[PDB]
């Protein structure tokens, strides 16, 4: 069961990178649509700080994958 | 095979979401090069009409990821 | 150990992917970033250079993952 949970509990890693990443799509879309459509100093702060909350959970996303990818493969070797 | 199949199976769901976000990242570094160039209302319809229908598969990717994370840990658990 | 390093070596070459997608995502975000703040044809010179370079990367892992899926799906099969 270990190893192979392992590498289960990798992929929802790497689909909630995907998901995260998909978000700050959504965030760049958003952006640009703005621009096209011509000011808003609130509104681009909030945006701002949601490209670096999206940022530093894709990140920690990243980090996770990283460290799930290290311990898979520990157990595969010598187990 | 079952379980192996099940897992190699998300690894190539995962890869086809991958795709499918490379392609709308190309739609969001065409809109900023129009943007930067300077109109065409005909062309931003288009490109909407296609931020859209990535949009619309990645999440339909994203749920089939999704689901079959659940069918392998279901098959994990008690097999 | 044979299709289990195989099914392991994927899932980094989706996360390297998924490492090269998000710097292409900060580049989006750069270059919304400069228009909202509005030139300097230099800067976008190079801005278009990394897009490239990072656009060519992932195809390069796009292409080393689904070169991998068909490796492993051979292996599954008829071993």
Do not use: C, F, P
Request: hydrophobic share 35%; glycine share 8%; charged share 20%.
């Amino acid at each position: 069961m270990q190893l192979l949970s392992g590498i289960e509990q990798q992929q929802n890693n790497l689909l909630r990178a995907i998901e995260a990443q998909q978000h700050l799509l959504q965030l760049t879309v958003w952006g640009i649509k703005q621009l096209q459509a011509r000011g808003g100093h609130t509104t681009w702060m909030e945006w701002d700080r949601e490209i670096n909350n999206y940022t530093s959970l894709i990140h920690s996303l990243i980090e996770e994958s990283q460290n799930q990818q290290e311990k898979n493969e520990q157990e595969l070797l010598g187990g």
